[PDB]
Design an enzyme around this catalytic site. Structure first.
Site, PDB file in Angstrom:
ATOM      1  N   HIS A 130      42.237  34.203  46.610  1.00  0.00           N
ATOM      2  CA  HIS A 130      41.208  35.195  46.947  1.00  0.00           C
ATOM      3  C   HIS A 130      39.857  34.510  47.162  1.00  0.00           C
ATOM      4  O   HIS A 130      39.126  34.825  48.110  1.00  0.00           O
ATOM      5  CB  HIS A 130      41.060  36.212  45.828  1.00  0.00           C
ATOM      6  CG  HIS A 130      42.378  36.797  45.422  1.00  0.00           C
ATOM      7  ND1 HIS A 130      43.084  37.654  46.258  1.00  0.00           N
ATOM      8  CD2 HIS A 130      43.100  36.653  44.298  1.00  0.00           C
ATOM      9  CE1 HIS A 130      44.195  38.011  45.648  1.00  0.00           C
ATOM     10  NE2 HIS A 130      44.225  37.415  44.467  1.00  0.00           N
ATOM     11  N   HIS A 149      32.144  31.745  41.434  1.00  0.00           N
ATOM     12  CA  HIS A 149      32.867  31.773  42.671  1.00  0.00           C
ATOM     13  C   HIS A 149      31.929  32.371  43.711  1.00  0.00           C
ATOM     14  O   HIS A 149      30.825  32.816  43.353  1.00  0.00           O
ATOM     15  CB  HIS A 149      34.191  32.567  42.566  1.00  0.00           C
ATOM     16  CG  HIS A 149      33.904  34.003  42.210  1.00  0.00           C
ATOM     17  ND1 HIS A 149      33.802  34.465  40.899  1.00  0.00           N
ATOM     18  CD2 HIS A 149      33.609  35.028  43.026  1.00  0.00           C
ATOM     19  CE1 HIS A 149      33.412  35.763  40.974  1.00  0.00           C
ATOM     20  NE2 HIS A 149      33.324  36.123  42.270  1.00  0.00           N
ATOM     21  N   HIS A 198      31.814  34.799  47.603  1.00  0.00           N
ATOM     22  CA  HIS A 198      32.380  35.629  48.645  1.00  0.00           C
ATOM     23  C   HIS A 198      31.670  35.258  49.940  1.00  0.00           C
ATOM     24  O   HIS A 198      30.443  35.050  49.940  1.00  0.00           O
ATOM     25  CB  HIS A 198      32.169  37.131  48.335  1.00  0.00           C
ATOM     26  CG  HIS A 198      32.701  37.520  46.990  1.00  0.00           C
ATOM     27  ND1 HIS A 198      33.973  38.038  46.795  1.00  0.00           N
ATOM     28  CD2 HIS A 198      32.154  37.379  45.749  1.00  0.00           C
ATOM     29  CE1 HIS A 198      34.161  38.265  45.480  1.00  0.00           C
ATOM     30  NE2 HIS A 198      33.036  37.843  44.804  1.00  0.00           N
ATOM     31  N   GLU A 237      28.619  40.734  49.215  1.00  0.00           N
ATOM     32  CA  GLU A 237      29.129  42.006  48.690  1.00  0.00           C
ATOM     33  C   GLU A 237      27.977  43.017  48.517  1.00  0.00           C
ATOM     34  O   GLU A 237      27.950  44.096  49.112  1.00  0.00           O
ATOM     35  CB  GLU A 237      29.880  41.768  47.373  1.00  0.00           C
ATOM     36  CG  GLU A 237      31.090  40.855  47.619  1.00  0.00           C
ATOM     37  CD  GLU A 237      32.185  40.939  46.586  1.00  0.00           C
ATOM     38  OE1 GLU A 237      31.915  40.784  45.400  1.00  0.00           O
ATOM     39  OE2 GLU A 237      33.341  41.275  47.004  1.00  0.00           O
ATOM     40  N   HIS A 276      28.586  34.438  42.479  1.00  0.00           N
ATOM     41  CA  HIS A 276      28.730  35.208  41.248  1.00  0.00           C
ATOM     42  C   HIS A 276      28.960  34.279  40.071  1.00  0.00           C
ATOM     43  O   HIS A 276      29.912  33.500  40.106  1.00  0.00           O
ATOM     44  CB  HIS A 276      29.939  36.146  41.372  1.00  0.00           C
ATOM     45  CG  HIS A 276      29.614  37.254  42.331  1.00  0.00           C
ATOM     46  ND1 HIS A 276      30.580  38.016  42.955  1.00  0.00           N
ATOM     47  CD2 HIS A 276      28.438  37.747  42.769  1.00  0.00           C
ATOM     48  CE1 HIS A 276      30.017  38.955  43.716  1.00  0.00           C
ATOM     49  NE2 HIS A 276      28.708  38.769  43.667  1.00  0.00           N
ATOM     50  N   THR A 329      34.141  43.268  41.288  1.00  0.00           N
ATOM     51  CA  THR A 329      34.291  43.620  42.702  1.00  0.00           C
ATOM     52  C   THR A 329      35.687  43.287  43.239  1.00  0.00           C
ATOM     53  O   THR A 329      35.965  43.533  44.412  1.00  0.00           O
ATOM     54  CB  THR A 329      33.240  42.915  43.569  1.00  0.00           C
ATOM     55  OG1 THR A 329      33.570  41.522  43.646  1.00  0.00           O
ATOM     56  CG2 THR A 329      31.844  43.199  43.088  1.00  0.00           C
ATOM     57  N   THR A 330      36.555  42.729  42.400  1.00  0.00           N
ATOM     58  CA  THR A 330      37.930  42.470  42.776  1.00  0.00           C
ATOM     59  C   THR A 330      38.818  43.198  41.790  1.00  0.00           C
ATOM     60  O   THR A 330      38.443  43.406  40.631  1.00  0.00           O
ATOM     61  CB  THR A 330      38.305  40.981  42.697  1.00  0.00           C
ATOM     62  OG1 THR A 330      38.260  40.528  41.335  1.00  0.00           O
ATOM     63  CG2 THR A 330      37.429  40.095  43.558  1.00  0.00           C
TER      64      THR A 330
HETATM   65  N1  LIG Z   1      33.567  39.340  41.962  1.00  0.00           N
HETATM   66  S1  LIG Z   1      33.132  39.465  40.343  1.00  0.00           S
HETATM   67  O1  LIG Z   1      32.773  40.935  40.070  1.00  0.00           O
HETATM   68  O2  LIG Z   1      31.937  38.608  40.018  1.00  0.00           O
HETATM   69  C1  LIG Z   1      34.502  38.912  39.345  1.00  0.00           C
HETATM   70  C2  LIG Z   1      35.543  38.255  39.998  1.00  0.00           C
HETATM   71  C3  LIG Z   1      36.656  37.830  39.288  1.00  0.00           C
HETATM   72  C4  LIG Z   1      37.663  37.093  40.092  1.00  0.00           C
HETATM   73  O3  LIG Z   1      37.753  35.890  39.785  1.00  0.00           O
HETATM   74  N2  LIG Z   1      38.342  37.572  41.154  1.00  0.00           N
HETATM   75  C5  LIG Z   1      39.220  36.730  41.946  1.00  0.00           C
HETATM   76  C6  LIG Z   1      38.466  36.108  43.142  1.00  0.00           C
HETATM   77  O4  LIG Z   1      37.080  36.401  43.353  1.00  0.00           O
HETATM   78  C7  LIG Z   1      36.676  37.991  37.880  1.00  0.00           C
HETATM   79  S2  LIG Z   1      38.148  37.516  36.951  1.00  0.00           S
HETATM   80  O5  LIG Z   1      38.182  38.493  35.785  1.00  0.00           O
HETATM   81  O6  LIG Z   1      37.921  36.117  36.354  1.00  0.00           O
HETATM   82  C8  LIG Z   1      39.592  37.547  38.021  1.00  0.00           C
HETATM   83  C9  LIG Z   1      40.176  36.341  38.437  1.00  0.00           C
HETATM   84  C10 LIG Z   1      41.268  36.354  39.311  1.00  0.00           C
HETATM   85  C11 LIG Z   1      41.756  37.575  39.807  1.00  0.00           C
HETATM   86  C12 LIG Z   1      41.157  38.784  39.417  1.00  0.00           C
HETATM   87  C13 LIG Z   1      40.071  38.763  38.537  1.00  0.00           C
HETATM   88  C14 LIG Z   1      35.645  38.629  37.222  1.00  0.00           C
HETATM   89  C15 LIG Z   1      34.556  39.040  37.966  1.00  0.00           C
HETATM   90 CL1  LIG Z   1      33.250  39.782  37.119  1.00  0.00          CL
HETATM   91 ZN   LIG Z   2      32.628  37.891  42.871  1.00  0.00          ZN
END
Ligand SMILES: NS(=O)(=O)c1cc(C(=O)NCCO)c(S(=O)(=O)c2ccccc2)cc1Cl
Ligand SMILES: [Zn+2]
Length: 257
Positions: free
Chosen positions: A61, A91, A93, A103, A116, A195-196
């Site tokens: 992703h 990470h 976007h 986003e 983020h 947001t995911t």
């Molecule tokens: N976009 S974000 O709101 O800052 C956000 C993005 C992700 C995220 O890594 N998503 C996977 C790819 O972005 C995570 S996570 O809980 O580590 C997670 C990892 C892999 C799959 C699903 C979820 C937490 C937040 Cl807070």
């Molecule tokens: Zn993010």
């Protein structure tokens, strides 16, 4: 199963994750005119002096840089927060073109990308527990525009070749996240969500007003990554952003002006 395509992208997520249509979803459009200045908001405190990056992973992703969060080493506090949040990962976007990829938006404006920095509230002991709480996470969001290079981003860009496809990971030590920050820590803040998927409503969003600039060549390198795994048909990792969601019953607060 979820992703960013026509058949599994954002508009589909609510099937597997019904909270997609919840009351505090992220991201949102930040309408800078109706944001409320709040003079009781504290300066944000970013203490990243002793951060320890461990690795970098293509999860199909985006790519996550992960940090050792087993001690108070890289912490966010102050700003709108009560208590102490520890950095777990960052990470980005980004878009297929420089005219989209963020986003959050600012007066409907889309930036090329958005960083983020995900932190969790130490009162909950670790990340897994924190995400189940309404004040579990604080995410520091920073916009990227294309212009001058960001020197402090280059170490990240240079490793991407090694994690091209879904599931690839590399050691990534001694990465200093201070090199990704803009001069100003003026921010907007509102309560929202991941947001995911799983889209959990556990995030205090802190979005910096000042973008960083990155070069076209830096963002071009992000766009060489793949959503697919090694030895599947190639799909470039681009447009891995969720669009703005309804603000509903929320007010965005500003630390400035
Ligand atoms: N976009 S974000 O709101 O800052 C956000 C993005 C992700 C995220 O890594 N998503 C996977 C790819 O972005 C995570 S996570 O809980 O580590 C997670 C990892 C892999 C799959 C699903 C979820 C937490 C937040 Cl807070
Ligand atoms: Zn993010």
């Amino acid at each position: 199963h979820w992703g960013y395509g026509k058949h599994n992208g954002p508009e589909h997520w609510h099937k597997d994750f019904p909270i997609a249509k919840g009351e505090r979803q992220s991201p949102v459009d930040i309408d800078t005119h109706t944001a409320k200045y709040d003079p009781s908001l504290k300066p944000l405190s970013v203490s990243y002096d002793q951060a320890t990056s461990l690795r970098i992973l293509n999860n199909g992703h985006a790519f996550n840089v992960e940090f050792d969060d087993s001690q108070d080493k890289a912490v966010l506090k102050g700003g709108p927060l009560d208590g102490t949040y520890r950095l777990i990962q960052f990470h980005f976007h980004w878009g297929s073109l420089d005219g989209q990829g963020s986003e959050h938006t600012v007066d409907k404006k889309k930036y090329a990308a958005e960083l983020h920095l995900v932190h969790w509230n130490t009162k909950y002991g670790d990340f897994g527990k924190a995400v189940q709480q309404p004040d579990g996470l604080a995410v520091l969001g920073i916009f990227l525009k294309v212009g001058s290079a960001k020197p402090g981003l280059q170490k990240v860009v240079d490793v991407l070749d090694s994690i091209k496809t879904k599931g690839k990971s590399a050691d990534f030590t001694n990465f200093d996240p201070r090199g990704l920050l803009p001069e100003s820590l003026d921010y907007w803040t509102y309560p929202g969500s991941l947001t995911t998927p799983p889209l959990l409503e556990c995030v205090t969003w802190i979005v910096l007003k000042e973008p960083i600039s990155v070069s076209s060549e830096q963002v071009l390198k992000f766009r060489k990554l793949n959503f697919n795994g090694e030895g599947e048909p190639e799909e470039l990792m681009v447009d891995n952003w969720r669009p703005a969601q309804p603000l509903k019953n929320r007010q965005i607060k500003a630390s400035f002006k």
